[PDB]
Amino acid sequence: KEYHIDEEVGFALPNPQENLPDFYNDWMFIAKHLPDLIESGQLRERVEKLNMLSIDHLTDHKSQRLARLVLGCITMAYVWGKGHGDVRKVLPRNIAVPYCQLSKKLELPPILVYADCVLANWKKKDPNKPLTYENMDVLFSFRDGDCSKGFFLVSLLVEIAAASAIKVIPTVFKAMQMQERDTLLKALLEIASCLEKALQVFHQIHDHVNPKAFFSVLRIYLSGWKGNPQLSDGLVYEGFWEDPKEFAGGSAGQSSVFQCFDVLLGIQQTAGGGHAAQFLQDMRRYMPPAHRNFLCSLESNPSVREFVLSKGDAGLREAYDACVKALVSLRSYHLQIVTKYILIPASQQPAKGTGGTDLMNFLKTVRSTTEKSLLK
Numbered sequence: 380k381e382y383h384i385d386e387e388v389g390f391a392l393p394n395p396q397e398n399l400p401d402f403y404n405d406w407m408f409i410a411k412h413l414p415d416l417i418e419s420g421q422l423r424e425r426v427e428k429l430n431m432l433s434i435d436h437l438t439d440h441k442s443q444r445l446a447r448l449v450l451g452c453i454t455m456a457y458v459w460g461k462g463h464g465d466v467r468k469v470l471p472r473n474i475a476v477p478y479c480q481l482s483k484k485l486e487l488p489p490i491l492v493y494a495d496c497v498l499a500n501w502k503k504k505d506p507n508k509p510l511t512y513e514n515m516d517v518l519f520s521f522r523d524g525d526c527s528k529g530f531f532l533v534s535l536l537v538e539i540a541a542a543s544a545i546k547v548i549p550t551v552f553k554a555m556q557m558q559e560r561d562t563l564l565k566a567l568l569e570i571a572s573c574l575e576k577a578l579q580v581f582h583q584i585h586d587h588v589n590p591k592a593f594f595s596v597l598r599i600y601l602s603g604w605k606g607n608p609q610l611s612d613g614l615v616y617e618g619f620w621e622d623p624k625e626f627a628g629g630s631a632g633q634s635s636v637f638q639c640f641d642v643l644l645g646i647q648q649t650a651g652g653g654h655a656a657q658f659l660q661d662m663r664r665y666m667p668p669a670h671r672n673f674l675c676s677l678e679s680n681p682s683v684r685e686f687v688l689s690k691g692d693a694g695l696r697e698a699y700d701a702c703v704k705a706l707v708s709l710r711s712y713h714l715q716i717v718t719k720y721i722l723i724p725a726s727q728q729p730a731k732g733t734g735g736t737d738l739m740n741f742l743k744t745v746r747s748t749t750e751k752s753l754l755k
């Protein structure tokens with residue numbers, strides 16, 4: 380099927396919708412003017428003084444995703460608010476019930492996710508320029524000096540960078556069942572080049588993001604109500620659910636990019652039964668419906684790994700390894716990001732990433748599992 384993947388931007392939503400139908404200018408204004416409404420303390424009230432708009436005037440997917448994004452950021456700004464510690468352990472029935480309903484139709488859970496605040500949360504400034512940081516901006520933000528532009532867009536520019544490798548994947552599987560060795564070597568080497576060029580994109584996080592800002596401000600807003608003490612037994616979605624419900628916060632863990640290439644190269648991240656594997660399977664529930672699909676479509680295919688090892692073919696192993704290396708490289712570099720942006724900021728606070736994991740030995744499990752797949 381068509382797995383909602385683009386030749387140019389891969390898993391990212393292509394040319395997203397910036398404006399909702401006029402019926403929803405109530406929603407739109409609260410989200411568009413979020414930095415000032417919590418700077419004041421009128422956000423929770425402006426949301427409480429909102430009547431229940433039904434969802435059935437959102438027609439196409441682009442719209443429903445922008446509504447997800449609007450209803451998403453509002454729900455976070457409400458619950459967390461100033462984010463200086465005072466929380467709302469219950470969500471207003473009037474924002475809850477339409478957001479819980481849109482989330483059920485899209486098969487996503489009712490909380491801001493990677494798909495919303497990165498993949499649907501962008502536009503290009505001058506629509507006849509390339510997809511660089513200068514010529515791009517996010518649609519929605521939480522506060523000022525939250526460095527949410529840098530964070531969300533460097534995240535995106537990696538997704539973009541990976542799209543050139545994802546489009547090669549069908550060549551790999553065709554080459555295997557057509558028994559075309561030269562085609563397959565070229566394909567894996569191409570996927571390799573794209574994945575090692577994506578490491579340079581990661582370097583931009585230092586340029587456009589600020590450690591203390593991310594950690595003390597933006598981290599609090601992308602945070603979830605699942606194993607969070609602040610909201611002991613989840614959040615109450617008044618009207619929709621009889622009890623309160625626990626849902627994990629936003630994470631690049633909800634990125635299909637890194638999981639896609641783990642599955643392709645037969646790196647069994649989602650096997651073994653432990654904490655790291657479990658997190659990575661669970662975060663697929665937070666991926667869009669058609670991406671969740673794409674990943675198990677890749678699991679359904681014959682193993683590139685089993686195929687490559689079946690032959691005494693140095694060049695093919697070298698190419699397969701070059702891919703696995705690229706993935707280690709990125710996860711090795713990503714460990715340095717986390718040290719700079721979470722570990723040290725936390726140590727100057729008189730860990731806990733947005734996802735909710737024992738992150739340092741979680742990442743190194745996931746990093747270790749990757750380099751265990753190196754053939755040689």
Ligand code: HEM
Nearest residue numbers: 533534537630631632634637720732733734735736738745
């Ligand atoms: C300031 C920047 C970043 C920080 C502070 C950060 C932090 C973290 C943390 C704490 C986790 C563990 C999951 C959790 O508990 O949330 C994680 C996982 C992950 N991050 Fe990041 N991250 C950053 C940038 C990026 C970017 C730009 C990407 C990709 C575009 C990325 C990709 C991932 C992936 C795929 C995982 C899941 C684990 C894995 O597959 O290796 N990260 N990150």
Ligand SMILES: O=C1C[C@H](c2c[nH]c3ccc(F)cc23)C(=O)N1
Nearest residue numbers: 534601629630631632732733734
């Ligand atoms: O603390 C973090 C940051 C990191 C992350 C990287 N890109 C993201 C996009 C959205 C989001 F909610 C979180 C992230 C993560 O998985 N936990």
